[PDB]
């Protein structure tokens, strides 16, 4: 064997071991999840507290790209934070040529194209993060999950990291029991909700919660993060249900 | 083990020991403190030598009049880093006149580092450092990791037996914190911190350095004699 | 990223060997049969187009491929190596000879050539050796008909008649003892065709044999009139119904 | 053996990496199938969506290459993405440099000759797809191009891909030893679809709904795939017969 | 050359004479100015003919590729394409163009690209060096939300009289319909349009 | 990365050898023999091809001898399409000497230059040396009839009488113990047949296992003449020395 | 130059002058302007006599590799446009003026060409010194629906207008005629209008005439 | 200023019964200053004959150059070059260096040797080949030759009286143009001998 030495190499099954290795990398990282609802996107993401000294609201993970798209993402930091760079010089080369800003599908490939180039080498290693992204465009609300391979597809909600397997369930209530539609201020408190239920599986340090959403009402279209009366409110309602 | 010979070989748990070799240099350096209140921010790290007949390595670099850094672990890697640090304050001031936000001069080190964590040939930085200082949001402190990793504190601690300054921090932010308008104060927490990580040993007047940013105070750095009166 | 195998990997064994020379020659081994005879007034190459199913359309996989008016190639090996072969042949006819002197490059001169190229994927950086043996027939004013057969190395010999791949050991016995330097092109096609049913299993028609001839010029293949000097291709493909005309009377 | 990880050859002559890549075709679980009419070329893949949290509609093996071109592809979908790009690329590059629209065989062509330099350059890995390309050419009539990563291309009467393959290719060569001709006798591309998903479930022994399938349609002048309407207004039509 | 575009309640038309001119001499009588880079996105041309067709050419592959990738682009994207090329090689082209066409959300629109490479979204535009000879006629005449019929007959008259004007314009009045219905393209002959 | 499958070209093993080059010459030492004798009045090249079918075509064939230009030809033993690479680029480097200084090329000068590229491929660059060792036959007004070696190593030297290829030990030998100073190109066409007669791997040298060609004075006062033997000159001149 | 293209029925037809000039000087009184670029695409050329030609040779050659690659007879709008998009790039140093016209599968086609790489389409067309001549004689006799000997006829009188009329042009006419589904053919010195009278006197010397200094044998041999 | 005429010169070729003729004078000046009597504008590869008027450096260049291209073709072809494929190469030459060109005007002249058909070419200085039944000339008198040619020339001359009429067009078209003549030499070229005379001319 030595197969799963060398970055791009075949095994004889057919798989890039190097790949399925980045993935153990973001399964060990913080949960991370989108929900896309009626007219948009919600993101939020648990924060492990590691001490008393970290600054509470000063260590910002979700990230704007251009100023209609959200990326947050589990697993090697740095490694989504090159991405999202990357990202942001895809949209911006997109926007100079065609004018508009960069429709979703189309970022999510720009993304799948460069994530997908550094599984075609020796010389690169995969990138160690699965990354969550969305926003609005023209023709309305996406979410995005996008895997270590290369991989993504359109999701309705998705969630990965350490706590992935009791977000992904919790997810799974909501597209059963809404198939309507679910409402931006509502999937706000669900996202909430779920990080909050998802931290079981990582409950040695307690942590801080993070949101950030776009919206056709409610943030016309731009990505902001949620804080003050909204962060709050949507704590409350995620602590109401754990109890 | 079969997957440590460089850094782009990730291991069957996902691993990068190349990186984590990196952050063991850090390990054996010599031990910093970072702390800040709402007004200053300080750094003091104890100086290693090599024998009777040294000098005390320098741990402390000035990178703008607003910003400056202490390491612990490779020194020309920590000269790499705070040179390109001085170029992109330098960049901030000559084509925007605006001094660089602590912030991204974090997420500026953090993007330089991981680049050669995901290429061939390269090596990860072997060197830890903490930064400080005073922008239009007052004052930071930020602790830089060669995996990229950067992040921002009340007080931190970096190098052999931190953890002992690192716990002191912990237990006495509540003080320090709120020591705002008073410079000698916040440093003295600042050298008490870091008294519980000595061993064998103690600071003397050739071995400590500290410096200190803020409100109405440029990154300056004291060495010498100017530390006597902390001792 | 970028290419950073710019070291040989075709290198010397202790035994004198290249191994990956070798190894290339023993997928041309396992390749299809295929043959070229050289006649007084023309020269034949013939493969057999063996199918990978039934409902593969195998008139669209050409295993023997026109390179200048008067050369044509065969092969045995690697069937996508030796496509791209062909591109690159096609083209260096071009650049390296007929944009200079106004004229096709004689038989051996383009054989050199791909040749060349060849050799070169059996020491530049980062490359295999080609897996495929070819078979170059051709005609030109100064040397008249030839036929060259081209191996992984880059050697090159000239034949009066030979074989290559699969059940090449048989069919140069074969060729051996009905070959002489009497042969009228006619009788080259008829003995092709003959060699080639020893090493082939199944149908044995004008539609799993491929067979194409360096003979005279042909003034209607050529496309248009009023120039005296161009009189025509030299390299014409037989036609399915050709060859089963032949078949009969075998 | 260190002939197992790069493209050199093995003592047999082999190329593990490419045997490799082929085994990595059916990473998907997915079956493809085309098929020509007299004037349209129908294309038809299994569509699977496991997890209820996928939205549907993003999950495609089907690609529109050009106006008259459409691409299946089996294999893993970043592979698929990348093979697709550059064949839009290429088709659009070709259109501009020739002043005319990039041929099904020629495209197949030039994207084989891509999968061939993988196999002999090391530093490039073989893309673990194979790719079906097809249309209605303008000299050649409805095609049908696969590429896979040996590099190896040709044409088809019909053909069909992924690990069931065999079944299917079965079932559709005794149809054209009955038939006797080189395609579907049929005027309307709405019935040469119904043949072939009619085909489909009798070789894999298998139903679908609308959400099973996924087609594409190649005519005169455009290559465009079926909506999950159009699809089981299909479906309706072969169950009340 | 006279060329322009004028957006209606169904959509937009483009219009241009014929004439290309070498000098004094009429190179050709009967060219076609009207040039497609997508299906409903034409435009017209003026300048450098060799620079307005190479500009058009890779216009029309970007599109197509854009295409390809992203679904049918915005009249608005075309035109950005175009004053990519036009601005950031300014130095080097005589290009004057109006890019002009019809999305189902937008309707009809023209914008309007002049030698230096700026973009100028319009009602309707004008161009060529026949243009000047128009501006007061066309100022006067042209109104919001004309019909089919009535934009038909404003472009018939006032490239009429750029026509009569110019020696550089002349030959036929050629149109093309841009709206939801399809793509129609419109002749029309001297002997008609020299007696308006 | 690729470090993995480097197998360094250019390294000293631990006595201080170049391993690609001893097992290139170990590679060269199963090829077809080539002889080649300088005389008083012109030189010999002979040299013995790779065991031929009878469907060769032996007429319009060459892989042992080429011509470089009117005044220099090579003998060649190892990889022929490694040689040919080496022959193109001599010949280039002739018609630069003669285009710059309107004079031929001195034979040392186009020998040092082809084996300071062999030379070349040793020490730098991390690719393979070439599988060849040649022997240069030529005339220059300097030192007029010369004959030299190079191989793989790049490593040069000049010779009255020398072999390359399969059994050079038996070769080198017999030529030791009949070549003479005064010697005549006649006489020393007979050595070079009667060497490879006694030395070949096959059961009898015959006209069509063989190339063959002479460098003499041989034409019209003071000019140079290449003959490259036809198989009909090769079969008489075997005759004529009685080897048939 | 003067050159023409007239299409017809069921195909088209180029010709051209044959004169060559240098300055007032006529270099070549036969010279050929008609260039196959594939055995049913031809183009005639006027301009820069070695840029028609090197433009010619160079595109024939990209257009018979890409013949080969794709499995398909060329096509006159491919010649088209890897001869503007060359010319263009050159931005007119190039001074090629080329009438393309051919047969492909496609159906039969006329264009014309400048040097600076813009492009048209017509059923007549004419280039060089003479192209005033010869649309005058074009606009005056041109209709649709010619037959093959009428076009032939058209075209090579406007090449006449050319030769009689425009002091750049002269000689001979050339006719390329080519026509959907048969092979192109050329006629070479199709007119020949301009043969030389028979000279006064034959300027053959007395031998010896001419005084010599020195002779001697040259070596052309080995 | 004007590179082809700074040195002057000339040469012209004439085809005849199965033998062609090339001839040039001797002249090399700068500009007004005759410099030297001895250089000749006619070489031959092979039995291939290249005549080059124009700037002298340029004409010794490409000497130099088609004397190397030629002996490579002989070394891989296995043959000497023909007349026809050796005006192929002179034109695909001068082309490469279409916008910093040689300043020449080459003439090719030779049998050959398979059809025992004798060839004659010219050149501009850019690659456009003028190959012609009957007569090439170039060089600073080239008006004049054209004069003389286009009004002695008849076709089918024996190799005796094409020599007689070759020299008297190159002796009186160079007698009236200041930079050429100070000597001249003729060549007669047949199947396989040829003939090399030098001329008796005014030495002003
Ligand atoms: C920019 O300067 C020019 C342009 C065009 C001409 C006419 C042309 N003659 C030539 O090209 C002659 C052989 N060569 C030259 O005049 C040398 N020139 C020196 C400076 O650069 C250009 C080359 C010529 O004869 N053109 C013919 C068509 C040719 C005939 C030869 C076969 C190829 C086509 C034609 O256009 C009519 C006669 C006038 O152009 C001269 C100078
Ligand atoms: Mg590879
Ligand atoms: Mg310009
Ligand atoms: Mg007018
Ligand atoms: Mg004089
Ligand atoms: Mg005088």
Same mark, same amino acid.
């Not at chain 2, 052999?160 to 912990?170: F, I, N, P």
């Not at chain 3, 390179?67 to 071009?94: E, F, N, Q």
């Not at chain 5, 060219?31 to 450098?48: A, F, N, P």
């Given at each position: 064997?030595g ?7 075949f095994?004889?099954?057919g ?7 980045? /993935? ?10 989108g929900?896309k ?17 970290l600054?509470?609201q000063?260590?910002?993970?979700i990230?704007?790209?251009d ?16 991405? /999202? ?22 970022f999510?490939?720009?993304? #799948?194209?460069? /994530? ?18 969305? #926003?609005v ?43 309507? #539609? ?32 776009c919206?056709?009402?409610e943030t016309? #279209?731009?990505?902001?993060? /949620?804080?003050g ?5 949507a704590?409350?309602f995620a ?5 | ?27 054996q350096?010599?031990?910093?403190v ?33 910003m400056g ?26 084509v ?22 995901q ?32 992040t ?61 940013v803020?409100?109405?105070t440029?990154?300056?750095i ?10 | 990223? &970028? ?20 190894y290339?020659?023993?997928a ?11 006649? &007084?007034?023309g ?16 008139? &669209?996989?050409? !295993?023997?491929?026109?390179?200048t008016?008067d050369?044509?190639?065969? @092969?045995?090996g ?8 062909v ?16 004229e @096709? ?11 060349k ?14 897996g ?5 027939? +051709?005609?030109?004013?100064?040397? +008249?008909?030839?036929? @060259? ?22 069919? !140069?016995?074969?060729?051996? !003892?009905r ?16 060699t080639? !049913?020893?090493?082939?299993? +199944?149908?044995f028609?004008?539609?799993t044999?491929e ?8 003034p209607?293949?050529?496309? @248009? ?11 014409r493909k037989?036609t ?7 078949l009969?009377?075998? | 053996?260190?002939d ?12 593990? =990496? ?17 098929? %020509? ?6 294309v038809?893949? =299994? ?33 698929? %993405?990348?093979?697709?790009?550059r064949?839009?690329?290429?088709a ?15 495209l ?16 490039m ?36 891909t992924?690990?069931? =393959? =065999?079944?299917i ?43 099973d ?10 290559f ?18 | 050359?006279?060329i ?35 299906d ?7 300048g ?35 004053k ?7 130095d ?29 979204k ?48 002349g ?11 399809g793509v129609?393209?419109?002749?029309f ?8 | 990365?690729?470090?993995?499958y480097?197998?360094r070209?250019t ?14 010459l170990?590679?060269? *030492? ?8 300088? $005389? *008083?009045?012109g ?10 079918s ?10 042992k ?9 090579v ?21 630069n ?21 062999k ?16 022997i ?29 290829? $399969? ?5 080198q ?6 070549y ?7 006489? $020393? ?7 490879? *007669?006694?030395?070949?791997? *096959? ?10 060609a002479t ?14 033997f036809?198989?009909?000159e ?11 | 130059?003067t050159?023409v ?8 037809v ?24 594939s ?23 990209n ?14 709008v491919?010649?088209?446009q ?15 003026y ?75 006419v ?21 043969v ?13 005439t001419?005084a ?11 | ?6 040195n002057?010169?000339?040469?012209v ?21 005759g ?7 006619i ?49 695909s ?13 080459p ?98």
């Amino acid at each position: 064997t030595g197969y799963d030495l060398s970055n791009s190499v075949f095994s004889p099954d057919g798989r890039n071991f190097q790949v399925e290795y980045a /993935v153990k990398a973001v399964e060990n990282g913080t949960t991370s999840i989108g929900i896309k609802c009626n007219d948009g996107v919600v993101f939020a993401v648990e924060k492990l507290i590691t001490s008393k000294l970290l600054v509470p609201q000063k260590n910002v993970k979700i990230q704007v790209v251009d100023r209609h798209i959200g990326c947050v993402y589990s697993g090697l930091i740095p490694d989504g934070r090159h991405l /999202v760079n990357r990202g942001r010089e895809e949209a911006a080369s997109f926007k100079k040529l065609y004018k508009t800003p960069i429709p979703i599908p189309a970022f999510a490939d720009r993304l #799948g194209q460069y /994530v997908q180039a550094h599984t075609l080498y020796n010389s690169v290693r995969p990138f160690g993060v699965s990354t969550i992204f969305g #926003g609005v465009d023209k023709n309305g609300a996406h979410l995005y999950m996008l895997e270590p391979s290369g991989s993504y597809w359109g999701y309705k909600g998705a969630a990965t990291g350490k706590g992935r397997q009791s977000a992904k369930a919790e997810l799974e209530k909501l597209v059963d029991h809404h198939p309507e #539609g679910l409402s931006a201020r509502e999937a706000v408190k669900q996202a909430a909700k779920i990080i909050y239920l998802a931290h079981e599986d990582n409950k040695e340090k307690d942590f801080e919660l993070e949101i950030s959403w776009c919206s056709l009402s409610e943030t016309n #279209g731009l990505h902001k993060f /949620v804080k003050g009366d909204l962060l709050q409110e949507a704590i409350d309602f995620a602590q109401k249900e754990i109890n | 083990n079969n997957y440590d010979g460089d850094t782009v070989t990730f291991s069957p748990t996902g691993r990068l020991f190349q990186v984590e070799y990196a952050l063991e240099a850090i390990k054996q350096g010599s031990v910093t403190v970072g702390l800040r209140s709402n007004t200053h921010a300080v750094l003091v790290a104890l100086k290693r030598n090599a024998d009777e007949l040294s000098s005390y390595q320098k741990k402390i670099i000035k990178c703008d009049e607003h910003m400056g850094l202490s390491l612990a672990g490779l020194a020309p890697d920590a000269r790499v880093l705070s040179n390109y640090l001085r170029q992109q304050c330098n960049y901030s001031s000559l084509v925007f006149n605006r001094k660089l936000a602590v912030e991204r001069a974090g997420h500026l080190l953090c993007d330089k580092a991981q680049k050669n964590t995901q290429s061939y040939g390269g090596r990860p930085y072997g060197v830890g450092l903490l930064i400080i200082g005073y922008d239009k949001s007052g004052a930071h402190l930020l602790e830089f990791q060669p995996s990229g990793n950067v992040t921002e504190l009340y007080g931190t601690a970096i190098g052999a037996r931190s953890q002992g300054a690192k716990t002191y921090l912990e237990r006495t932010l509540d003080t320090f914190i709120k020591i705002d308008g008073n410079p000698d104060e916040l440093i003295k927490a600042g050298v008490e911190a870091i008294s519980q990580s000595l061993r064998d040993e103690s600071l003397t007047v050739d071995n400590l350095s500290i410096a200190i940013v803020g409100k109405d105070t440029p990154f300056t750095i004291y060495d010498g004699e100017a530390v006597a009166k902390y001792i | 990223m &970028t290419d950073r195998y710019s070291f040989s990997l075709t290198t010397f064994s202790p035994s004198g060997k290249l191994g990956q020379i070798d190894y290339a020659l023993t997928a041309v081994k396992q390749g299809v049969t295929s043959l070229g005879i050289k006649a &007084t007034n023309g020269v034949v190459i013939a493969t057999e187009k063996k199918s990978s199913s039934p409902l593969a359309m195998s008139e &669209t996989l050409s !295993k023997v491929s026109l390179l200048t008016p008067d050369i044509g190639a065969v @092969y045995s090996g690697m069937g996508p190596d030796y496509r791209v072969l062909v591109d690159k042949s096609r083209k260096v006819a071009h650049t390296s000879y007929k944009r200079i002197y106004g004229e @096709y490059p004689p038989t051996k001169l383009l054989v050199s050539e791909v040749a060349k190229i060849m050799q070169e994927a059996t020491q530049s950086g980062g490359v295999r050796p080609f897996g495929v043996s070819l078979l170059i027939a +051709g005609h030109d004013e100064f040397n +008249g008909f030839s036929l @060259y057969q081209v191996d992984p190395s880059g050697s090159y010999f000239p034949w009066k008649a030979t074989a290559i791949g699969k059940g090449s050991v048989a069919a !140069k016995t074969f060729l051996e !003892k009905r070959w002489n330097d009497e042969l009228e092109l006619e009788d080259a096609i008829h003995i092709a065709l003959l060699t080639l !049913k020893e090493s082939v299993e +199944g149908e044995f028609n004008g539609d799993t044999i491929e067979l194409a001839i360096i003979g005279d010029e042909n003034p209607d293949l050529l496309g @248009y009139t009023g120039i005296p000097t161009d009189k025509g291709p030299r390299f014409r493909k037989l036609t399915s119904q050709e060859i089963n005309d032949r078949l009969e009377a075998l | 053996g260190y002939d197992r990880h790069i493209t050199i050859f093995s003592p047999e002559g082999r190329l593990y =990496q490419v045997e490799y890549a082929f085994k990595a075709t059916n990473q998907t679980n997915i079956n493809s199938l085309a098929v %020509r009419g007299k004037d349209c070329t129908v294309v038809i893949s =299994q569509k699977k969506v496991p997890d209820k949290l996928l939205d549907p509609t993003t999950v495609s093996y089907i690609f529109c290459i050009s106006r008259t071109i459409g691409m299946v592809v089996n294999g893993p979908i970043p592979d698929a %993405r990348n093979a697709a790009l550059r064949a839009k690329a290429e088709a659009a590059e070709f259109r501009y440099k020739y002043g005319y629209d990039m041929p099904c065989d020629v495209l197949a062509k030039r994207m084989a000759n891509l999968s061939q330099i993988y196999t002999q350059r090391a530093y490039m890995r073989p893309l673990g797809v194979i790719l079906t390309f097809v249309s209605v050419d303008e000299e050649l009539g409805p095609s049908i191009y696969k590429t896979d990563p040996a590099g190896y291309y040709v044409g088809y009467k019909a053909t069909a891909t992924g690990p069931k =393959q =065999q079944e299917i290719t079965t079932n559709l060569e005794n149809h054209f030893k009955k038939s006797k001709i080189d395609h579907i006798n049929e005027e309307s591309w709405e019935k040469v679809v119904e043949f072939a998903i009619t085909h489909m479930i009798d070789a894999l022994g298998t139903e679908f709904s609308k959400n099973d399938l996924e087609v594409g349609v190649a005519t005169k002048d455009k290559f465009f795939t079926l909506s999950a309407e159009n699809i089981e207004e299909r479906l309706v039509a072969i169950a009340e017969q | 050359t006279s060329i322009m575009a004028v957006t209606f309640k169904d959509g937009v038309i483009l219009g241009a004479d014929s004439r290309t001119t070498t000098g004094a001499y009429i190179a050709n009588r009967v060219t076609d100015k009207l040039t497609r880079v997508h299906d409903k996105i034409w435009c017209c041309r003026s300048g450098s003919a060799a620079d307005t067709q190479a500009i058009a050419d890779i216009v029309q592959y970007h599109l197509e590729l854009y295409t390809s990738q992203y679904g049918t682009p915005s009249t608005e994207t075309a035109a950005s394409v175009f004053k990519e090329l036009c601005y950031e090689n300014k130095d080097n082209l005589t290009a004057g163009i109006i890019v002009a066409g019809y999305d189902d959300k937008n309707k009809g629109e023209v914008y309007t690209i002049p030698l230096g490479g700026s973009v100028h979204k319009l009602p309707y535009a004008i161009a060529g060096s026949g243009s000047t000879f128009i501006y007061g006629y066309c100022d006067k005449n042209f109104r919001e939300n004309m019909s089919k019929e009535e934009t038909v007959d404003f472009i018939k008259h006032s490239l009429s009289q750029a026509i009569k004007w110019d020696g550089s314009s002349g030959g036929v009045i050629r149109m093309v319909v841009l709206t939801a219905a399809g793509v129609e393209r419109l002749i029309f002959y001297p002997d008609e349009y020299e007696q308006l | 990365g690729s470090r993995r499958y480097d197998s360094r070209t250019t390294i000293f093993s631990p006595e201080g050898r170049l391993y690609q080059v001893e097992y290139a010459l170990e590679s060269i *030492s199963h090829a077809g023999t080539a002889i080649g004798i300088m $005389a *008083s009045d012109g030189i010999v090249l002979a040299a013995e091809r790779k065991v031929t079918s009878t469907l060769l075509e032996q007429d319009t064939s060459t892989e042992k001898l080429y011509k470089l230009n009117d005044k220099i030809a090579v003998a060649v033993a190892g990889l022929t399409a490694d040689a040919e690479i080496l022959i193109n680029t001599a010949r280039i480097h002739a018609q630069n000497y003669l285009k710059t200084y309107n004079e031929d090329i001195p034979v040392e000068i186009l020998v040092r230059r082809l084996s300071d590229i062999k030379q070349g491929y040793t020490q730098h660059g991390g690719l393979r040396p070439f599988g060849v060792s040649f022997i240069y036959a030529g005339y220059d007004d300097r030192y007029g009839y010369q004959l030299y070696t190079s191989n793989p190593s790049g490593n040069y030297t000049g010779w009255k009488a020398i072999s390359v290829g $399969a059994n050079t030990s038996a070769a080198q030998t017999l030529l030791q113990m009949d070549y003479k100073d005064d010697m005549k190109v006649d006489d $020393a066409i007979e050595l070079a047949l009667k060497t490879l *007669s006694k030395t070949t791997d *096959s059961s009898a040298l015959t006209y069509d296992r063989l190339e063959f060609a002479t460098i003499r004075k041989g034409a019209n006062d003071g000019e140079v003449y290449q003959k490259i033997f036809k198989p009909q000159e090769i079969k008489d001149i075997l005759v004529k020395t009685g080897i048939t | 130059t003067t050159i023409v293209g007239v299409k017809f029925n069921n195909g088209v037809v180029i010709a051209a002058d044959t004169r060559s000039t240098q300055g007032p000087i006529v270099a070549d009184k036969n010279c050929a302007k008609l260039h196959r670029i594939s055995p049913k695409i031809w183009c005639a050329g006027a301009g820069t006599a070695a840029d028609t030609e090197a433009v010619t040779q160079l595109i024939g050659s990209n257009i018979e590799l890409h013949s080969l690659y794709t499995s398909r007879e060329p096509r006159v709008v491919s010649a088209l446009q890897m001869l503007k998009q060359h010319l263009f790039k050159y931005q007119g140093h190039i001074g090629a003026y080329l009438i393309v016209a051919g047969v492909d599968p496609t159906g039969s086609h006329l264009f014309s060409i400048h040097a600076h790489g813009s492009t048209d389409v017509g059923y007549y067309l004419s280039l060089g010194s003479g192209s005033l001549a010869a649309m005058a004689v074009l606009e005056s006799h041109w209709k649709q629906d010619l037959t093959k000997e009428e076009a032939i006829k058209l075209a090579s009188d406007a090449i006449q207008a050319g030769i009689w009329n425009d002091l750049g042009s002269g000689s001979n006419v050339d006719v390329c005629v080519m026509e959907i589904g048969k092979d192109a053919e050329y006629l070479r010195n199709y007119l020949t209008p301009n043969v030389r009278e028979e000279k006064q006197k034959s300027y053959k010397f007395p031998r010896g005439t001419t005084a010599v200094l020195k002779e001697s044998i040259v070596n052309i041999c080995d | 200023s004007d590179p082809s005429s700074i040195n002057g010169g000339i040469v012209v070729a004439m085809t005849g019964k199965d033998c062609v003729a090339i001839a040039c004078d001797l002249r090399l000046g700068s500009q007004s200053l005759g410099v030297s009597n001895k250089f000749e504008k006619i070489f031959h590869y092979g039995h291939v004959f290249l005549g080059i008027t124009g700037l002298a450096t340029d004409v010794t260049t490409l000497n130099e150059m088609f004397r190397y291209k030629t002996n490579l073709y002989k070394l891989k072809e296995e043959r000497a070059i023909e007349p026809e494929t050796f005006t192929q190469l002179v034109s695909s030459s001068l082309y490469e260096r279409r916008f910093g060109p040689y300043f020449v005007g080459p003439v090719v002249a030779g049998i050959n040797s398979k059809s025992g058909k004798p060839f004659i070419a010219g050149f501009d200085l850019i690659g456009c080949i003028d190959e012609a039944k009957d007569f090439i000339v170039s060089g600073t008198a080239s008006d004049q030759l054209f004069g003389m040619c286009e009004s002695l020339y008849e076709p089918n001359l024996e190799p005796e009286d094409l020599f007689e009429t070759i020299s008297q067009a190159l002796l009186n078209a160079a007698d009236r143009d200041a930079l050429s003549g100070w000597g001249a030499v003729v060549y007669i070229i047949k199947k396989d001998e040829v003939v090399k005379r030098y001329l008796k001319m005014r030495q002003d």
